[PDB]
UniProtKB/TrEMBL annotation:
One CC-aspect GO term: periplasmic space
UniProt KW keywords: Periplasm, Plasmid, Signal
Record organism: Rhizobium etli (strain ATCC 51251 / DSM 11541 / JCM 21823 / NBRC 15573 / CFN 42)
SUPFAM superfamilies named in the record: Periplasmic binding protein-like II
Intracellular or extracellular location(s): Periplasm
Family statement: Belongs to the bacterial solute-binding protein 1 family.
This protein's name: Sugar ABC transporter, substrate-binding protein
InterPro entries: Bact_solute-bd_prot1 (IPR050490), SBP (IPR006059)
Keyword Ribonucleoprotein: no
Length: 393
């Protein structure tokens, strides 16, 4: 008989915690759970405080994002799982590279259990009306831009944008890490030059909404895609469940839709993408390491992945079984290509492990905003990213 205390966030709004607990307790009825909800607004601080002074009150530590992971490892608050993973023979391949991404000097301290990655959503009505065939699961970014440009046009009610690049720097920058040659945390940002050029071209041509208009109006990407005036939307997989729900309620008018794989740069395999994660970990000072390790393995593995997926959340595991559960959700697009897009070839983290990530964000966002508003040239903006990040202390 053990009670595992599970530090987590947003208990009432997070549909998967309860069924995960009930599914595990069904097989191990002697293990019970006290969920400790520390809130999302500054979870990182709150879990840090709760792990101080060698405290053993917490067993299972949820990790919100990569910076939270990095902080916990720097503080020494979570157990190395390397040996456990190896002994249990947990196959890393269906995590798409995330295990390796989370390995810090040969050591892994969390098992990812949810991971959203980047894809493209498209509105079939806009393709049909223009007589342009639907996007495929093998598109280069040059092809994507050609299609966006063809779809953009019309007057009045006919007025359509071929695509929408949201105001986050990631919509422009992520395509630039997909070849594996650079990350967005280290060194010289010159590599981003063609990536900015293509985005600025789309904008200057009116094929996508302008960055300045999106910033001044604060228009969320969903509102325009819901309006039915956007052909193609590069966005994370989180938008799948949202689009499903809103098409059901009638708030989204883009009721004929699909997804495809993230476009790839020349010479990169289709389905190469970027991702965000949440993970589970064990308090270094837990007195119930065995029980905690078994639970976190369950959650991150196929059984937990099925439970997560049944709530309309993308688990970290990407397999045939997870794809079937996702694509069987009523409202999920029933074309073959959409289902095939659910398992990436390879996922890079949007932002690699780096202790200065939050400070880097500030430098990159400022320059991004200057470039996209035509206030600094691309070359000058990338120089500002390179020099600003170097100067972080
Ligand atoms: Cl390209
Ligand atoms: Cl993340």
């Amino acid at each position: 008989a053990v009670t595992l205390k599970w530090a987590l966030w947003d208990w009432d709004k997070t549909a998967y915690y309860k069924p995960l607990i009930e599914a595990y307790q069904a097989k191990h009825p002697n293990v019970k759970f006290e969920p400790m909800d520390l809130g999302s607004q500054d979870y990182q601080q709150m879990i840090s405080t709760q792990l101080t002074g060698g405290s053993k009150d917490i067993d299972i530590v949820t990790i919100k994002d990569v910076p939270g992971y990095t902080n916990l490892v720097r503080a020494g608050n979570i157990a190395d799982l390397s040996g456990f993973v190896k002994d249990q023979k947990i196959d890393p391949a269906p995590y798409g590279g995330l295990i390796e991404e989370l390995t810090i000097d040969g050591k892994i301290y969390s098992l990812p259990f949810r991971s959203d990655f980047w894809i493209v959503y498209y509105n079939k009505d806009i393709f049909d009306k223009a007589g342009v065939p639907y996007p495929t699961n093998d598109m280069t970014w040059a092809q994507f831009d050609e299609t966006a440009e063809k779809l953009a046009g019309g007057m009045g009610t006919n007025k359509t944008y071929g695509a929408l690049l949201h105001t986050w720097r990631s919509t422009v920058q992520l395509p630039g890490i997909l070849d594996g040659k650079h990350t967005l945390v280290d060194g010289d940002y010159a590599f981003l030059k063609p990536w900015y050029e293509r985005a600025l071209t789309l904008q200057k041509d009116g094929a996508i909404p302008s960055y300045a208009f999106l910033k001044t109006s604060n228009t969320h990407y969903s509102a325009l895609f819901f309006n039915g005036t956007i052909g193609m939307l590069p966005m994370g997989t989180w938008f799948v469940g949202t689009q499903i729900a809103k098409v059901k309620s009638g708030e989204s008018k883009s009721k004929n839709w699909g997804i495809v794989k993230f476009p790839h740069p020349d010479g990169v395999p289709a389905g190469t993408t970027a991702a965000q994660i949440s993970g589970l970990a064990v308090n270094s000072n837990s007195q119930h390491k065995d029980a905690a390790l078994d639970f976190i393995k369950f959650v991150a593995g196929p059984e937990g992945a099925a439970v997560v997926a049944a709530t309309g959340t993308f688990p970290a595991l990407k397999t045939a079984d997870v794809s079937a559960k996702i694509a069987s959700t009523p409202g999920f697009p029933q074309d073959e290509a959409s289902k095939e897009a659910l398992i990436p070839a390879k996922a890079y983290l949007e932002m690699a492990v780096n202790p200065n990530a939050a400070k880097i964000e500030v430098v990159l966002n400022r320059a991004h905003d200057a470039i996209m508003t035509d206030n600094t040239s691309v070359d000058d903006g990338l120089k500002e990213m390179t020099e600003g990040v170097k100067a972080i202390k």
